[PDB]
Amino acid sequence: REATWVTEKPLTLKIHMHFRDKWVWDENWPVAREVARLTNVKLVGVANRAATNSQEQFNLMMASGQLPDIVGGDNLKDKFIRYGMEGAFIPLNKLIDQNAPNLKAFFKTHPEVQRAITAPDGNIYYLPYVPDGLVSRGYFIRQDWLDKLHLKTPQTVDELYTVLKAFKEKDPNGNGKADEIPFINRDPEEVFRLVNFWGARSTGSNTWMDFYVENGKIKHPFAEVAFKDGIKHVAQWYKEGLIDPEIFTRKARSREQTFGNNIGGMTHDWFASTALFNDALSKNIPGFKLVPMAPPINSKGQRWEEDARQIPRPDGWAITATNKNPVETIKLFDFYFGPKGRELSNFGVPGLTYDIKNGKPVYKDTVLKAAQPVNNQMYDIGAQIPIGFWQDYEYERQWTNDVALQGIDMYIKNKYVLPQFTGVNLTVEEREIYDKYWPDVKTYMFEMGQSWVMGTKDPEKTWNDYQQQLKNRGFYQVMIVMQKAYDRQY
Numbered sequence: 001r002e003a004t005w006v007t008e009k010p011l012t013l014k015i016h017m018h019f020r021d022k023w024v025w026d027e028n029w030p031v032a033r034e035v036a037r038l039t040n041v042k043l044v045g046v047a048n049r050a051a052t053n054s055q056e057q058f059n060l061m062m063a064s065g066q067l068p069d070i071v072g073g074d075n076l077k078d079k080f081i082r083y084g085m086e087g088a089f090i091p092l093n094k095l096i097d098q099n100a101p102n103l104k105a106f107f108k109t110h111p112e113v114q115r116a117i118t119a120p121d122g123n124i125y126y127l128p129y130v131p132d133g134l135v136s137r138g139y140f141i142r143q144d145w146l147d148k149l150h151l152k153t154p155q156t157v158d159e160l161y162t163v164l165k166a167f168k169e170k171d172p173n174g175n176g177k178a179d180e181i182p183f184i185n186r187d188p189e190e191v192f193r194l195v196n197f198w199g200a201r202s203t204g205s206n207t208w209m210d211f212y213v214e215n216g217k218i219k220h221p222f223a224e225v226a227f228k229d230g231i232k233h234v235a236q237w238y239k240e241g242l243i244d245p246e247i248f249t250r251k252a253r254s255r256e257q258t259f260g261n262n263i264g265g266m267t268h269d270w271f272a273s274t275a276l277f278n279d280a281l282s283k284n285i286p287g288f289k290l291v292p293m294a295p296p297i298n299s300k301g302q303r304w305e306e307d308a309r310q311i312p313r314p315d316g317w318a319i320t321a322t323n324k325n326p327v328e329t330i331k332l333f334d335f336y337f338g339p340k341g342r343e344l345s346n347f348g349v350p351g352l353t354y355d356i357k358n359g360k361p362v363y364k365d366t367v368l369k370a371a372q373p374v375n376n377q378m379y380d381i382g383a384q385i386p387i388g389f390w391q392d393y394e395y396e397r398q399w400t401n402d403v404a405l406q407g408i409d410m411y412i413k414n415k416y417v418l419p420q421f422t423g424v425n426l427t428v429e430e431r432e433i434y435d436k437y438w439p440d441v442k443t444y445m446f447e448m449g450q451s452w453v454m455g456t457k458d459p460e461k462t463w464n465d466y467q468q469q470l471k472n473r474g475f476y477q478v479m480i481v482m483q484k485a486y487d488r489q490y
Ligand SMILES: [Ca+2]
Pocket: 171, 172, 173, 174, 175, 176, 177, 178, 179, 180
């Protein structure tokens, strides 16, 4: 028995957790096993490991009969709220106030986080993934390629065009072949963010395709005329091969592939893991130098960094109405917000991935010297996963090299990061319109966006049909309630 046990009698619960379109909960994970040992509660996964879309899996689970005991994953906030009000997920307010002292304290000191996860009916239907940090992404460019081609760091979009064209046509890796791919990215959604170069927004926060506010008015990036004009430019860059032709399909290992084979010239991604490639590829590609770059001056005369860490994220886990042990479950959930629980969910397992030295968790050299980014290494053993947990930036600091640190400092110092959208508080009736139309409009917007970038549809010629479809699909009904809810707060 352990003082951390949340139940005297061993308890096993079923969890459906499919995340980042590639992973599922693994009861064999070192972290899962350690938490089970300490709490006496074991979670067994029931998600389909042979599936490449996490949202589709949530929907499939919801239509495959009786739900499991717990459901977790990334980008599920809206589903947790929608189905929570439908009775599929239970309210946690009471359970927390009565059995979770760590969470109760956390929320008292983090009122903004509590508000962000609360539903229109005032109920909390899930515990969020709470990131720790300030900046997230930044632009990175191949300094060695710039040097080899005698080009200066691009300061404007026009200068950037010239530089990327040079990367594509001037054989910077010197193998006599036109194999270079100027701009690459792990996230297909980043291709949409390129409209920033032409003064248009792509999202209001770290949450993909989120709304934003301008002069007291709620707006959505994909519906603005600025997007039409901006995406036309992105389409041109894609047409000319300045943007990875496989940008919508390569995905997850784009960096390992393109930087690893010395064909990638630039990206926009997280500072720590991206800068790590300088160390991982130092042996195979001497001179490889991927460095942070300030955003180029855009068509509106400004340097924009649209992304920032979002606290909390629309990720996490919830308790279903079929869970027969809600009290034991919330106690398990609370364990993660305690000192030991937070340490495990962030660093892995003591003696395996880290050791306590001078009272502080310190990653082993084998982890820090690995070619794989530390967050990827954590995913592999059940840490840094999108359950309800509190991220600790100290875990990240340990593998943020000087190149990354200096990039982070530059972005913080020069204030490139745009104000982030912190959401609004919808009434129950307003939420009904949101859940009825938004999901499908969002999917439609992505589809149109991809068509415009790839050239299968001309944004200029299809814009009217598009706006008509947005109206028919309920987009403006959603915009109307969003604005009303906004005016209530401010
Ligand atoms: Ca070449």
